[PDB]
């Protein structure tokens, strides 16, 4: 009831005492909690379901629509369509499901509460930024009264600032590890790199941070080692192929954070 009625500070108390989100969320707890009009709802969510009462497969068609490209949401895969259509009806990561729920239903304080305690939080900030931003773009076009694109933008810019602040946090503690956070496969969010997930939404303060502009400067070098290598020795070694063999390079301890082919 506290989730449907948007009581954030009762979700705080009520999981702080004794309720695990594991074994709370079953599949009919999402169908319910998604198709209830007993709280503040998102009126344009049904406009996105018009691409097709509400089933989770019709939800992940919305999520695959909002996060474009080859984004495969977990609900539309074969294993979920076999557990669906009738212990196994729980979710392995429940707060990844309620972060998407609280972003689609346009309830922000619930979303910034469900964000801040789960695993892989900087990826949830960017997923939430992309979902909000593309709902804003799919609300500027087709609405007349309280279009709320002015409201959904500044909800994507409140998560897209969290992502930046977390990456500025993790950059200052270790740099070779923070550059690993940018490109590791997420495996919950459709095997998307965190940095690609922040380029799909055009999140310029993330891609222009010194963590991503340092990783791009380490992908530009490739295997070579331009910290000590001559700049002109690249052009010389292009023109003179026996000058390739003796310039400089990098070892696998230095190529660890660089995503190789």
């Amino acid at each position: 009831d506290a989730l449907v009625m948007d009581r954030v500070s009762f979700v705080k108390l009520l999981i702080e005492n004794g309720v695990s989100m594991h074994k709370f969320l079953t599949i009919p707890r999402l169908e319910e909690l998604y198709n209830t009009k007993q709280g503040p709802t998102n009126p344009m969510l049904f406009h996105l379901i018009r691409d097709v009462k509400i089933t989770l497969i019709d939800i992940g068609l919305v999520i695959e629509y909002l996060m474009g490209g080859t984004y495969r949401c977990t609900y539309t895969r074969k294993r979920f369509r076999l557990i669906y259509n009738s212990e196994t009806k729980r979710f392995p990561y429940p707060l990844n499901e309620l972060l998407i729920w609280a972003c689609l239903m346009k309830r922000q304080v619930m979303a910034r509460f469900l964000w801040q305690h789960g695993e892989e939080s900087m990826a949830k900030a960017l997923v939430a930024c992309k979902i909000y931003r593309s709902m804003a773009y799919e609300a500027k076009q087709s609405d007349l009264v309280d279009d709320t694109s002015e409201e959904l933008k500044q909800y994507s810019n409140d998560f897209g600032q969290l992502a930046v602040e977390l990456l500025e946090q993790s950059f200052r503690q270790d740099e070779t590890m923070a550059m690993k956070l940018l490109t590791y496969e997420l495996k919950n969010w459709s095997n998307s790199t965190c940095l690609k997930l922040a380029v799909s939404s055009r999140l310029r303060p993330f891609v222009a941070h010194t963590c991503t502009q340092m990783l791009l400067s380490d992908m530009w070098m490739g295997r070579l080692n331009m910290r000590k290598n001559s700049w002109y020795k690249v052009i010389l070694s292009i023109l003179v192929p026996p000058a390739i063999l003796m310039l400089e390079y990098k070892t696998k301890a230095e190529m660890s954070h660089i995503p190789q082919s």
Partner: protein, 317 residues
């Protein structure tokens, strides 16, 4: 040792510099082609040019097919379609043409082929700014020029109204006996346009006076044009081109801060193209299309050592 060739050639620096060295070879050959006398049969240099633009177009089709309206968003891809399409319109009229052979090599089809062949180098020199825009310092200026051309447009419109409102009564006073021709447009825009840029046409002012060129134009009324040119040069050169310096001057810092971030963002899409380009430049790409992700690899140990680094950074946040 043979992993040092595979390691060297697949770096994006080496794909980049290998591509721009062959691009500067393309421009040097293409302006030797263009500047020197064209003949009926193409020279050695010209087939290298057509080989570059043909196989370059093949690589652009491969880069579009591996979504079209995404590719038209960059301003150096709209210029690539116009460069490649108008090159072969120029090469169609150059090569597939009637000779009408003489000591005079000018036939009406060959000449237009050579002029669509001369005006086309401009697109490739503009394409050099896509290369000059990849380093830390010259990137924001190239990303800044377009962001300020798109921003001064309504000072340039006011300068064009001042340009017309001097161009029309200056001809109309000086040249009363005209017949309708399209040289009226050329001469009302033409002569007051170069007065912004230094040429005051000093002897053409005071057309009635001695020490003057154009002495045949001494009709009644021509004593007005030094006053019209005086007010025109005052307004244009002292108000308009001096409100444009103030405009760039006060817009510069916000457009540098914006354009620096737009460069830092588009550096991602620039580097991820060079993880996909084959290791040959487009004249040497006759091999790597007859022949034919970037994921990060962590062990099970370091995925856990990374996974409790992220939790520590969030809790410290």
């Amino acid at each position: 040792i043979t992993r040092k060739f595979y390691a060297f050639y697949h770096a994006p620096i080496v794909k980049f510099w290998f591509n721009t060295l062959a691009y500067l070879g393309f421009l040097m050959l293409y302006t030797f082609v263009v500047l020197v006398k064209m003949e009926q049969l193409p020279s050695v240099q010209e087939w290298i040019v057509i080989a570059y633009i043909f196989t370059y177009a093949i690589e652009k089709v491969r880069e579009v097919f591996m979504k079209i309206k995404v590719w038209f968003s960059d301003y150096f891809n709209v210029s690539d379609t116009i460069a490649i399409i108008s090159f072969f319109v120029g090469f169609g009229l150059r090569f597939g043409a009637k000779w009408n052979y003489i000591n005079a090599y000018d036939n009406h089809v060959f000449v237009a082929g050579r002029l669509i062949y001369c005006l086309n180098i401009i697109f490739w020199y503009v394409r050099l700014l896509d290369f000059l825009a990849v380093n830390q310092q010259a990137g924001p200026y190239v990303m800044m020029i377009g962001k300020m051309v798109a921003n001064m447009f309504y000072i340039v419109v006011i300068m064009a109204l001042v340009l017309l409102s001097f161009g029309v009564p200056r001809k109309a006073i000086l040249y009363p006996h005209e017949e309708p021709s399209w040289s009226l447009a050329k001469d009302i825009v033409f002569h007051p346009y170069w007065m912004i840029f230094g040429e005051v046409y000093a002897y053409e002012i005071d057309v009635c006076a001695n020490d003057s060129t154009l002495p045949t134009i001494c009709g009644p009324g021509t004593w007005l044009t030094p006053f019209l040119q005086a007010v025109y040069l005052f307004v244009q050169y002292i108000i308009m081109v001096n409100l444009l310096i103030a405009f760039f001057n006060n817009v510069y810092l916000q457009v540098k801060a914006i354009s620096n971030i737009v460069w830092k963002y588009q550096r991602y899409h620039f580097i991820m193209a060079y993880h996909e380009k084959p290791v040959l430049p487009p004249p040497l790409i006759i091999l790597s299309h007859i022949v034919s992700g970037p994921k990060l690899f962590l062990t099970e140990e370091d995925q856990k050592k990374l996974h409790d680094f992220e939790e520590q950074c969030v809790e410290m946040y």
